[PDB]
Design a protein around this ligand. Structure first.
Ligand SMILES: CCCCCCCCCCCCCCCCCC(=O)OC[C@H](COP(=O)([O-])OCC[N+](C)(C)C)OC(=O)CCCCCCCCCCCCCCCCC
Ligand SMILES: CCCCCCCCCCCCCCCCCC(=O)OC[C@H](COP(=O)([O-])OCC[N+](C)(C)C)OC(=O)CCCCCCCCCCCCCCCCC
Ligand SMILES: CCCCCCCC/C=C\CCCCCCCC(=O)O[C@@H](CO)COP(=O)(O)OC[C@H](CO)OC(=O)CCCCCCC/C=C\CCCCCCCC
Ligand SMILES: CCCCCCCC/C=C\CCCCCCCC(=O)O[C@@H](CO)COP(=O)(O)OC[C@H](CO)OC(=O)CCCCCCC/C=C\CCCCCCCC
Ligand SMILES: CCCCCCCCCCCCCCCCCC(=O)OC[C@H](COP(=O)(O)OCCN)OC(=O)CCCCCCCCCCCCCCCCC
Ligand SMILES: CCCCCCCCCCCCCCCCCC(=O)OC[C@H](COP(=O)(O)OCCN)OC(=O)CCCCCCCCCCCCCCCCC
Ligand SMILES: CCCCCCCCCCCCCCCCCC(=O)OC[C@H](COP(=O)(O)OCCN)OC(=O)CCCCCCCCCCCCCCCCC
Ligand SMILES: CCCCCCCCCCCCCCCCCC(=O)OC[C@H](COP(=O)(O)OCCN)OC(=O)CCCCCCCCCCCCCCCCC
Ligand SMILES: CCCCCCCCCCCCCCCCCC(=O)OC[C@H](COP(=O)(O)OCCN)OC(=O)CCCCCCCCCCCCCCCCC
Ligand SMILES: CC(C)CCC[C@@H](C)[C@H]1CC[C@H]2[C@@H]3CC=C4C[C@@H](OC(=O)CCC(=O)O)CC[C@]4(C)[C@H]3CC[C@]12C
Ligand SMILES: CC(C)CCC[C@@H](C)[C@H]1CC[C@H]2[C@@H]3CC=C4C[C@@H](OC(=O)CCC(=O)O)CC[C@]4(C)[C@H]3CC[C@]12C
Ligand SMILES: CC(C)CCC[C@@H](C)[C@H]1CC[C@H]2[C@@H]3CC=C4C[C@@H](OC(=O)CCC(=O)O)CC[C@]4(C)[C@H]3CC[C@]12C
Ligand SMILES: CC(C)CCC[C@@H](C)[C@H]1CC[C@H]2[C@@H]3CC=C4C[C@@H](OC(=O)CCC(=O)O)CC[C@]4(C)[C@H]3CC[C@]12C
Ligand SMILES: CC(C)CCC[C@@H](C)[C@H]1CC[C@H]2[C@@H]3CC=C4C[C@@H](O)CC[C@]4(C)[C@H]3CC[C@]12C
Lengths: 713, 647
């Protein structure tokens, strides 16, 4: 085939696994926000310029398909113009120009240097190496051919914010051109092309090793920095921000790639038809690359729409992962026979199930080891996760026993499909559970009937399925193992949960003295914050959002099954739906891990008790902090802490020496003793370790939460 | 074919010590401050290096390893360990003897082989003997597992001496040292990689192969950048006792250890093929010369014992490794070729050293002229020396590009080159006594300039009246015959005692003294080589060593010159200013300020992190309209300058 699709998944794992490694490192405060700036400077000013220089000095401009560049550039310009006008017409008068200057850039710029390059190299190295050059051609060319328009639009906006007695516009045009010329990519590309013309595409040997060493350390480093910068960016957005972000992501990952594919298929005059289809697929894939992080730094330099654009970049990368994975497979699909189609869909199911089960084992271990599964909603989603991991295990066994005798086929098929239906109806069970918890407090919600339904009814349905039906037939896919009776059974067992999901969420919206440690009465405020904590740990919004991201795939499964039931014609319209079902059914572990495998609940609460247990395993028989504490006590004890630390009369006796953790973090941020919330909590943990800060009851360690801690001495 | 790809060694060094230099000026120009470097350090120590070890050791084949040579390196390292430990124990202050005996021997045994050693070993042995690449991931982890526990136990003993209690059993300190060693990402990662190598069949899963390759390839360049980033503001003035212990430790690291490793290899190894054993011993020598690993510095700062000595030793070892790792590798590959190839190799190494050194001289003379230092007479002597050095390097390159060519241009390049070279010696010679006359009086600039340019021209003239250039000689020292060489000897003759009698006037600016001292030592080496040729007249596989040494020096002192002079210390905002006037303007700052004083106050209070962050904050307040120099003539800097506070 044209693309090595089988090697797409590992590269994606490298592309995002490092980013996840850059996230958990930045989430566990391993690398603070300030410490990430050093890595950012290294990747931006030293690794990227060397990469561009080395990759374009050898570049042969005489063997460059300029038609491909023309097609991509006209596609980008057309979408730029479309969004620019569609913004200038309706956007708010006060800041129409600011929106019109950044949104086209967000919809046209791609993260191709750090994220696009590994994927392109994995897919196109043994077939079409020539595709690798256009990343270093299109991105810088489009960086100086489209960005200047947005930049001068931003200058117009800031002039509207700084109106003066001026009429000429040469100043703003010059400033906007200087802004794009000061980008390291642009002038590094200019220098690289100049030196390419100076030399004969032969980097000097004395400097080639240096350039290679400084350039090879960009890809992984850039992904790590992207993961570091992807920490604490996406927050709650207004519904208008919600819809505009939906539109922008659609323009970047659904409109632009289609425009590029159309432009390539219209402009390319290549005689080889196979090369033409490969060119079109490559252009389409190049469209799907996520929003480059440079848009966020552009916006914060301009200081306009920073939060929305940063959330857009982060969410764009998130959706670019599965959209790219689905896309490339869809393009490679119409080149192989249906039996290879089944082989490939089984392979992608196996891979997605492997990674999903690993993530789900991690999440289940976190949930069970933290003892948070005891409470009801958490127990329910826990059962859903066990179902979602059993289905992945069954997918693995299925991949290892497909096309084998029926004796063990019974057990493998029942094991897979009981879990599948368990997830299906457990979605609706979560829906009704949230519905009734919002309907009233202390609702009866018999957990026994719910568990023996989400785990019992699927057993009954799979049992009646196995009793009847015509199980004969050499069917590779699990969907057609028994035949029409099995698919009819899947359809009805699908529709119910969607019916439950389709009603519960609607009503969900419709319904919606002393100084030291003090006595339980003298520390009654500690009891109030304790009751606030147990008021938390419910994460209802997380549960309902989980329900929505599951019912999306549930609707996809409904469409796929009813299509075969009624239309009963593949016609290439059903194969893509089968692929989407294979992706969702065995990939739901990815979303479950993404909402619950890594949250703000395993930072220190389970870590502290794990460390305590490790210490107690041996306890039966076996200075920088000091300087920081000295600084705090000789310099920042007579400061605004005086009103920061205070406790109201706790009934009759009060500590009067307690402060709020979030208030302390905000105070440290505002004074500047720390950098951000992470540095502030690191400072607080150090000061706690110094015997200066401790909880009023010592029950909880210091954290960025509405918890009330004493200042001791 | 040669056992080591010597011709590829120089660019790889330029690959490493270039990127290291990139990490230096990045941190020197405050692009990446001290705190900013910690993110890079964490990324390279907890994500890049562990992945590199995992990937390289899971696929590593333990059944195809020449174990004997690995054993030999461990015995050599243990021998140096034993010698340094016992020698430090016999002579040391009894208040810190244990700390000195715990940190010095590991300094002489641990090497920077993952960041610096690996690229060089790869360059030297990739197209001929790839099997050498495995030992860099076997010699190091085994050495960490088997050597540093003793030094860590010694450090814990010293801490016990500082924290004496009523306990006798040493199981606590042994356990603590073992746990601390095991807690490093370069031991437990070894254990995990070996466990997975045995579990698997040395085939990393395809779902993780790309991830490991992406996370490991971003180490070497990033590790070198972090090394150069930590290599700023570490080396400082030390005491004479500190000086001698430092020189002894560095000599043990780069001279005693490689020779002892070579000896141990030629005993223990039983290779049937002589070529394999010779190349293997050369590998042992080249491993012994790797500079001190930065992990020793983090060990010292963790124990908080002898931080400055250990850091300075690491920095200076990294500096001195490159010249030694170059000349020793060249000398090791020397005895395998015909003498005309040796002469050609000498010309090539001279050319490479000369071109890099000439770029360096452009930098250094630019430092002296743009800063107007060269106008001042103590740097005027420095700069005419540096220009002479630039001309001799350039003449070396033109010599290489015109060797064995027409005499009508060969004589011109000959005079152009040796005028400047005889100059270089003549200058450093008389600049000894000239520094005498500058520190102790009138000095005529005309006489010194016409003695540094005219007198060498006088020897050149009296040389070309009576000489024999008739034969074509690729080497330049003997192109014009013994008359040239005795004239070379005479220039080396007069210069050394003129400098030698000057020393009787120095001890019986300090930067210039250091220049003069080191170049005088190099001139002594050249004089020894020339003396050796002029009376002994026997190569004996030795003249090639001395001739290569003076080729390295005479065309490579400019490296010293730029390294001393080329890098000198003499060469958004609204919020923080709002915070400054709320909580810190009324603080002890109120009690014109010296810029160093306010930088120090900021460091004590904690608004900044280090000197670089403090000066960045000061300049940012300057751009914030708060800090201003008393006249506005200057800009914020860390020096004894009085700056106003505005309002
Ligand atoms: C504007 C000021 C800043 C930029 C720096 C100055 C401009 C760029 C350098 C000069 C112009 C380009 C010259 C090289 C190309 C033409 C000549 C050529 O090919 O020579 C081949 C020759 C090689 O010789 P050769 O090709 O004859 O090969 C024969 C080699 N033997 C005999 C051994 C077999 O030189 C080079 O390789 C080019 C110079 C490379 C430099 C070597 C390392 C020096 C370290 C510093 C490098 C520069 C850093 C600049 C940093 C800038 C940012 C601050
Ligand atoms: C100690 C707790 C933390 C450690 C993590 C959990 C333990 C380690 C992983 C499980 C145990 C070892 C399993 C591998 C050995 C046997 C399986 C094997 O190799 O067979 C090949 C099989 C693959 O099957 P295959 O080789 O037949 O592949 C053929 C595939 N087709 C048919 C499509 C061509 O599995 C693997 O590749 C290895 C395990 C999967 C890992 C894939 C990456 C998942 C992403 C997350 C990685 C885990 C991160 C852990 C981080 C921990 C610290 C935070
Ligand atoms: C031995 C036999 C097995 C060896 C296996 C070898 C391979 C592993 C290599 C080395 C293992 C040991 C190294 C660990 C040392 C101690 C760790 C340590 O010590 O690290 C501390 C450093 O300081 C962390 O400190 P912390 O604050 O306590 O951590 C709390 C933090 C808050 O989120 O939790 C976390 O996520 C951090 C915990 C990370 C979990 C995050 C989730 C990522 C994991 C899996 C799911 C991936 C699939 C999902 C996406 C798939 C596609 C992308
Ligand atoms: C045009 C056609 C030609 C261009 C060629 C293109 C290729 C390069 C690509 C782009 C270049 C320009 C773009 C860079 C932005 C401008 C700089 C910039 O903008 O970067 C600022 C940082 O933000 C500069 O900061 P600074 O404060 O001005 O520097 C002061 C500082 C204090 O010591 O001095 C220094 O050392 C810093 C000064 C560092 C230079 C010192 C010399 C080091 C180099 C070589 C020889 C070393 C020899 C020794 C070892 C030899 C073997 C290893
Ligand atoms: C989960 C809910 C899902 C809801 C989905 C709803 C779909 C709507 C489909 C119809 C709209 C089509 C696109 C035209 C834009 C319509 C304007 C719009 O959506 O709202 C503009 C938004 C409102 O802002 P406002 O409420 O005034 O806020 C004031 C305080 N900030 O103002 C802004 O935020 C400023 C930006 C306005 C311009 C946005 C342009 C978006 C890009 C469109 C690209 C289209 C390309 C495709 C063309 C054909 C390709 C073949
Ligand atoms: C084998 C030779 C070894 C030589 C080793 C020593 C020289 C290495 C190269 C110079 C090292 C840095 C010199 C300047 C130090 C200051 C910091 C720095 O690098 O600047 C960052 C700069 C980014 O640009 P700037 O304008 O600062 O920022 C824009 C503002 N938004 O970044 C840049 O623009 C790039 C500067 C860093 C170099 C990275 C690679 C750039 C291209 C280098 C080509 C190869 C070098 C030879 C020159 C070409 C001739 C062949
Ligand atoms: C109007 C035209 C629509 C056309 C649709 C065509 C297919 C979709 C292509 C574009 C998709 C754009 C998705 C972008 C989502 C942006 C929503 C957003 O901003 O959500 C923010 C939210 C974070 O929530 P926050 O409030 O910060 O934190 C509290 C959470 N408890 O975070 C979230 O909740 C993130 C939500 C996104 C989840 C992933 C979505 C994947 C979509 C692509 C999958 C592949 C195609 C799907 C086809 C489905 C067919 C039925
Ligand atoms: C295809 C896989 C994709 C999966 C992506 C997500 C998982 C990647 C693996 C874990 C990523 C980091 C998880 C932990 C984050 C917390 C910070 C951290 O890394 O801890 C630092 C720790 C240092 O070691 P420690 O002894 O804890 O500290 C020494 C004290 N001076 O650091 C360490 O010990 C090293 C932790 C990072 C590991 C880097 C790579 C090493 C090999 C693991 C490969 C990835 C997992 C796949 C396993 C394949 C083989 C089974
Ligand atoms: C006693 C046994 C003798 C054995 C001889 C053979 C062994 C050779 C290998 C070991 C040599 C290591 C040399 C290291 C010297 C350490 C000097 C030191 O610690 O001084 C610190 C000093 C910084 O002083 P500071 O006050 O910060 O700066 C003042 C500014 N002017 O900084 C300095 O002054 C740094 C001085 C660096 C010297 C580099 C010498 C290069 C050697 C390698 C070249 C090849 C071999 C040359 C052999 C010479 C033979 C004549
Ligand atoms: C077709 C796909 C499934 C191929 C494999 C891609 C995975 C490597 C991707 C897909 C979904 C991704 C996750 C989607 C969402 C999140 C949440 C995100 O953090 C949050 O919880 C949100 C808050 C924030 O981002 O600041 C961090 C990245 C992470 C774990 C992503 C990590 C990488 C994942 C698992
Ligand atoms: C191939 C299939 C399996 C899709 C693969 C991709 C999904 C697994 C990813 C893509 C986008 C991700 C979502 C992007 C954004 C968020 C918001 C995030 O919420 C936060 O903002 C966390 C912080 C907080 O607000 O408390 C929680 C994870 C979630 C739902 C992510 C969950 C995992 C998702 C759906
Ligand atoms: C045989 C050699 C010449 C082969 C080529 C190797 C070079 C790439 C090496 C050798 C000499 C090295 C230089 C020797 C001395 C210096 C000065 C040094 O600065 C200091 O003295 C630090 C002072 C401080 O941090 O305060 C920084 C590294 C540098 C430029 C070194 C960078 C790397 C160089 C040029
Ligand atoms: C064989 C030839 C090519 C020599 C190659 C090595 C030299 C270029 C290097 C090796 C060690 C270097 C020295 C290591 C440390 C320093 C200390 C440094 O002094 C400082 O601390 C600078 C800052 C300050 O104190 O102001 C001055 C340069 C110097 C002598 C370096 C000068 C250059 C040296 C001799
Ligand atoms: C073999 C096929 C039919 C799969 C069905 C297996 C059945 C017998 C097993 C496998 C996993 C089991 C579940 C695993 C975990 C839990 C959570 C616990 O708090 C209650 C029981 C419950 C909910 C179990 C019920 C029975 C269960 C569903």
């Amino acid at each position: 085939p044209s693309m090595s699709i089988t090697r797409l998944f590992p590269a994606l794992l490298e592309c995002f696994g490092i980013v996840l490694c850059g996230y958990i490192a930045g989430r566990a405060n391993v690398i603070t926000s300030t410490q990430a700036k050093g890595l950012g400077n290294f990747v931006s000013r030293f690794a990227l310029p060397a990469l561009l220089f080395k990759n374009m000095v050898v570049l042969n401009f005489s063997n460059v398909d300029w038609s491909f560049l023309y097609s991509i550039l006209i596609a980008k310009a057309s979408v730029f113009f479309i969004v620019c006008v569609l913004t200038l017409l309706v956007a708010s008068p006060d800041s129409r120009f600011s929106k019109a200057g950044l949104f086209p850039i967000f919809a046209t710029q791609s993260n191709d240097f750090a994220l696009g390059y590994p994927i392109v190299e994995a897919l196109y190295q043994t077939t079409y190496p020539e595709y690798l050059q256009y990343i270093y051609l299109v991105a810088p060319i489009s960086l100086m051919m489209l960005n200047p328009i947005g930049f001068i639009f931003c200058e117009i906006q800031k002039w509207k914010d700084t109106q003066n007695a001026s009429q000429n516009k040469i100043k703003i045009v010059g400033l906007g051109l200087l802004r794009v010329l000061q980008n390291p990519i642009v002038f590094m590309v200019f220098i690289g092309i100049a030196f390419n013309f100076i030399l004969d595409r032969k980097v000097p040997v004395y400097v080639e090793n240096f350039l290679d060493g400084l350039g090879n350390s960009f890809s992984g480093s850039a992904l790590f920095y992207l993961g570091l910068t992807m920490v604490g960016k996406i927050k709650r957005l207004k519904k208008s921000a919600f819809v505009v972000l939906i539109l922008l992501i659609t323009a970047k990952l659904l409109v632009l790639p289609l425009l590029c594919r159309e432009m390539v298929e219209l402009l390319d005059k290549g005689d080889s038809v196979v090369n033409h289809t490969s060119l079109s697929n490559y252009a389409f894939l190049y469209g799907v690359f996520p929003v480059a992080p440079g848009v966020a730094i552009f916006a914060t330099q301009f200081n306009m729409e920073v939060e929305i654009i940063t959330s857009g970049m982060v969410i764009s990368t998130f959706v670019s992962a599965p959209i790219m994975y689905v896309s490339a497979w869809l393009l490679t699909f119409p080149t192989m026979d249906p039996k290879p189609l089944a082989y490939a869909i089984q392979n992608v199911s196996f891979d997605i199930s492997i990674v999903s089960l690993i993530s789900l084992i991690w999440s289940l271990a976190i949930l069970l080891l933290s003892k948070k599964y005891k409470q009801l909603p958490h127990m329910l989603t826990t059962n859903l996760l066990i179902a979602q991991s059993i289905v992945c295990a069954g997918m693995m066994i299925w991949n290892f026993v497909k096309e084998k005798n029926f004796v063990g086929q019974i057990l493998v098929f029942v094991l897979l499909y009981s879990s599948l239906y368990s997830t299906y109806l457990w979605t609706g069970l979560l829906a009704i559970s949230l519905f009734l918890l919002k309907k009233r407090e202390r609702v009866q919600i018999p957990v026994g009937i719910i568990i023996i339904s989400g785990w019992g009814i699927p057993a009954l349905l799979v049992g009646v399925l196995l009793i009847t039906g015509k199980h004969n037939g050499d069917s590779i896919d699990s969907a057609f193992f028994y035949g029409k009776e099995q698919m009819i059974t899947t359809a009805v067992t699908l529709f119910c949960s969607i019916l439950i999901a389709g009603i519960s969420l609607m009503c969900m919206n419709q319904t919606a003295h002393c100084v030291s440690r003090c006595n339980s009465q003298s520390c009654i405020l500690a009891q109030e914050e304790e009751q606030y904590l147990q008021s938390g740990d419910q994460q209802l919004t997380r549960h309902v959002l989980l329900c929505l991201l599951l019912i999306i795939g549930l609707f996809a499964n409904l469409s796929s099954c009813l299509w075969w039931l009624f239309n009963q014609e593949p016609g290439r319209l059903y194969v893509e739906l089968q692929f989407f079902c294979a992706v969702f059914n065995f990939g739901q572990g990815f979303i479950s891990f993404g909402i619950f495998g890594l949250d703000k609940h395993l930072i220190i609460l389970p870590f502290k008790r794990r460390l305590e247990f490790l210490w107690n395993n041996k306890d039966t028989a076996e200075e920088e902090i000091k300087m920081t504490c000295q600084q705090f006590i000789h310099y920042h004890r007579d400061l605004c802490i005086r009103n920061i630390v205070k406790e109201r009369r706790c009934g009759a006796k009060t500590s009067a020496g307690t402060f709020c953790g979030c208030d302390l973090v905000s105070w440290l941020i505002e004074v500047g003793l720390a950098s951000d919330r992470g540095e502030a909590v690191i400072y607080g943990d150090r000061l706690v370790q110094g015997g200066v800060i401790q909880h009023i009851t010592n029950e909880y360690e210091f954290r960025d939460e509405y918890l009330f801690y004493r200042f001791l001495q």
